[PDB]
Write a structure and sequence with these properties.
mainly alpha, Recoverin, domain 1, 6 helices, 49% helix, 0% strand, binds the ligand Cc1cc2c(cc1F)OC[C@@H](NS(=O)(=O)c1cc(C(=O)N3CC(C)(C#N)C3)c(C)[nH]1)C2, phosphoprotein
Protein backbone atom coordinates (compact mmCIF):
# COMPACT_ATOMS: atom_id res chain seq x y z
CA UNK A 1 0.00 0.00 0.00
CA UNK A 2 2.08 2.89 1.32
CA UNK A 3 5.34 1.26 0.23
CA UNK A 4 6.57 4.75 -0.65
CA UNK A 5 6.45 6.06 2.92
CA UNK A 6 6.90 2.64 4.52
CA UNK A 7 10.19 2.22 2.65
CA UNK A 8 11.03 5.92 2.85
CA UNK A 9 11.68 5.56 6.58
CA UNK A 10 14.50 3.20 5.59
CA UNK A 11 15.81 5.43 2.81
CA UNK A 12 16.33 8.18 5.39
CA UNK A 13 19.87 8.99 6.54
CA UNK A 14 21.59 7.85 9.73
CA UNK A 15 21.12 11.32 11.22
CA UNK A 16 17.38 11.13 10.52
CA UNK A 17 16.65 7.88 12.36
CA UNK A 18 19.12 8.96 15.04
CA UNK A 19 17.46 12.30 15.76
CA UNK A 20 13.97 10.86 15.29
CA UNK A 21 14.79 8.16 17.84
CA UNK A 22 15.88 10.71 20.44
CA UNK A 23 12.36 12.15 20.22
CA UNK A 24 10.52 8.82 20.28
CA UNK A 25 12.19 8.14 23.63
CA UNK A 26 10.31 10.99 25.31
CA UNK A 27 7.33 10.69 22.96
CA UNK A 28 6.69 7.14 24.17
CA UNK A 29 7.75 7.84 27.76
CA UNK A 30 5.48 5.82 30.02
CA UNK A 31 3.60 4.12 27.19
CA UNK A 32 2.66 0.46 27.59
CA UNK A 33 4.56 -0.86 24.57
CA UNK A 34 6.74 2.18 23.95
CA UNK A 35 4.15 3.31 21.41
CA UNK A 36 2.31 6.58 20.81
CA UNK A 37 -1.33 6.37 21.91
CA UNK A 38 -3.94 9.06 22.55
CA UNK A 39 -2.39 9.69 25.97
CA UNK A 40 1.27 9.65 24.95
CA UNK A 41 0.42 11.78 21.91
CA UNK A 42 -2.01 14.15 23.59
CA UNK A 43 0.73 14.90 26.12
CA UNK A 44 3.07 15.99 23.33
CA UNK A 45 0.53 17.87 21.22
CA UNK A 46 -0.12 20.09 24.24
CA UNK A 47 3.57 20.27 25.15
CA UNK A 48 4.15 22.13 21.89
CA UNK A 49 1.81 24.85 23.11
CA UNK A 50 -1.69 23.67 22.21
CA UNK A 51 -4.63 21.73 23.65
CA UNK A 52 -6.39 19.31 21.27
CA UNK A 53 -9.41 17.15 22.09
CA UNK A 54 -9.56 13.46 23.10
CA UNK A 55 -11.91 12.64 20.22
CA UNK A 56 -9.48 14.07 17.66
CA UNK A 57 -6.39 12.71 19.40
CA UNK A 58 -7.51 9.23 18.34
CA UNK A 59 -8.11 10.40 14.77
CA UNK A 60 -4.50 11.36 14.08
CA UNK A 61 -3.41 8.14 15.78
CA UNK A 62 -5.32 5.77 13.51
CA UNK A 63 -4.78 8.20 10.64
CA UNK A 64 -1.14 7.07 10.59
CA UNK A 65 -1.50 3.81 12.52
CA UNK A 66 -0.79 0.81 10.29
CA UNK A 67 -2.62 -1.75 12.43
CA UNK A 68 -5.39 0.68 13.31
CA UNK A 69 -5.39 -0.42 16.94
CA UNK A 70 -4.76 3.02 18.40
CA UNK A 71 -0.98 3.31 18.63
CA UNK A 72 2.11 4.14 16.58
CA UNK A 73 5.40 2.22 16.58
CA UNK A 74 8.86 3.35 15.48
CA UNK A 75 8.54 2.72 11.75
CA UNK A 76 4.93 3.91 11.77
CA UNK A 77 6.27 7.16 13.22
CA UNK A 78 8.86 7.72 10.49
CA UNK A 79 6.24 6.76 7.90
CA UNK A 80 4.18 9.84 8.78
CA UNK A 81 7.12 11.93 9.98
CA UNK A 82 8.90 11.53 6.64
CA UNK A 83 5.93 13.12 4.87
CA UNK A 84 4.95 15.35 7.80
CA UNK A 85 7.38 18.12 6.85
CA UNK A 86 6.83 17.33 3.17
CA UNK A 87 3.17 18.19 3.73
CA UNK A 88 2.10 15.16 1.69
CA UNK A 89 0.51 13.05 4.43
CA UNK A 90 -3.17 13.50 3.55
CA UNK A 91 -3.97 17.19 3.22
CA UNK A 92 -4.28 20.55 4.96
CA UNK A 93 -8.07 20.72 4.95
CA UNK A 94 -9.13 21.37 8.53
CA UNK A 95 -7.18 23.98 10.48
CA UNK A 96 -5.54 21.19 12.46
CA UNK A 97 -1.99 20.50 11.28
CA UNK A 98 0.94 18.94 13.13
CA UNK A 99 4.50 19.56 11.93
CA UNK A 100 7.46 17.20 12.32
CA UNK A 101 10.24 19.71 12.99
CA UNK A 102 8.00 21.59 15.43
CA UNK A 103 7.38 18.47 17.52
CA UNK A 104 11.08 17.60 17.65
CA UNK A 105 11.77 21.10 18.97
CA UNK A 106 9.84 19.98 22.04
CA UNK A 107 11.28 16.49 22.50
CA UNK A 108 14.85 17.67 21.90
CA UNK A 109 15.23 21.13 20.41
CA UNK A 110 16.58 22.98 17.38
CA UNK A 111 19.04 20.12 16.90
CA UNK A 112 16.28 18.46 14.87
CA UNK A 113 15.96 21.19 12.24
CA UNK A 114 19.11 22.48 10.54
CA UNK A 115 21.29 19.51 11.50
CA UNK A 116 18.47 16.96 11.28
CA UNK A 117 18.13 15.67 7.72
CA UNK A 118 21.61 14.81 6.47
CA UNK A 119 20.24 13.74 3.09
CA UNK A 120 20.32 17.41 2.09
CA UNK A 121 24.11 17.04 2.10
CA UNK A 122 24.43 14.87 -1.01
CA UNK A 123 21.46 12.50 -1.04
CA UNK A 124 18.32 13.58 -2.90
CA UNK A 125 15.77 15.67 -1.02
CA UNK A 126 12.36 16.66 -2.38
CA UNK A 127 9.94 19.16 -0.84
CA UNK A 128 12.59 20.58 1.49
CA UNK A 129 12.86 24.37 1.65
C1 LIG B 1 0.25 8.96 16.41
C2 LIG B 1 0.55 10.48 15.66
C3 LIG B 1 -0.16 10.83 14.52
C4 LIG B 1 0.06 12.07 13.90
C5 LIG B 1 1.03 12.93 14.43
C6 LIG B 1 1.73 12.58 15.59
C7 LIG B 1 1.49 11.35 16.21
F1 LIG B 1 2.18 11.02 17.31
O1 LIG B 1 1.34 14.16 13.91
C8 LIG B 1 0.81 14.42 12.60
C9 LIG B 1 -0.66 14.00 12.49
N1 LIG B 1 -1.21 14.40 11.16
S1 LIG B 1 -2.14 15.80 11.06
O2 LIG B 1 -3.11 15.60 10.00
O3 LIG B 1 -1.25 16.95 11.02
C10 LIG B 1 -3.13 16.07 12.49
C11 LIG B 1 -3.02 16.91 13.58
C12 LIG B 1 -4.13 16.68 14.45
C13 LIG B 1 -4.48 17.34 15.71
O4 LIG B 1 -5.06 16.73 16.61
N2 LIG B 1 -4.13 18.66 15.86
C14 LIG B 1 -3.42 19.65 15.07
C15 LIG B 1 -3.30 20.48 16.37
C16 LIG B 1 -1.93 20.38 17.05
C17 LIG B 1 -3.72 21.87 16.23
N3 LIG B 1 -4.05 22.97 16.11
C18 LIG B 1 -4.37 19.55 16.98
C19 LIG B 1 -4.91 15.71 13.82
C20 LIG B 1 -6.19 15.07 14.23
N4 LIG B 1 -4.29 15.35 12.65
C21 LIG B 1 -0.73 12.48 12.68
Amino acid sequence: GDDIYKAAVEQLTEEQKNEFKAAFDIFVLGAEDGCISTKELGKVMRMLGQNPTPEELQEMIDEVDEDGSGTVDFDEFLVMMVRCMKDDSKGAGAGVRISADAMMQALLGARAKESLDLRAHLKQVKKED
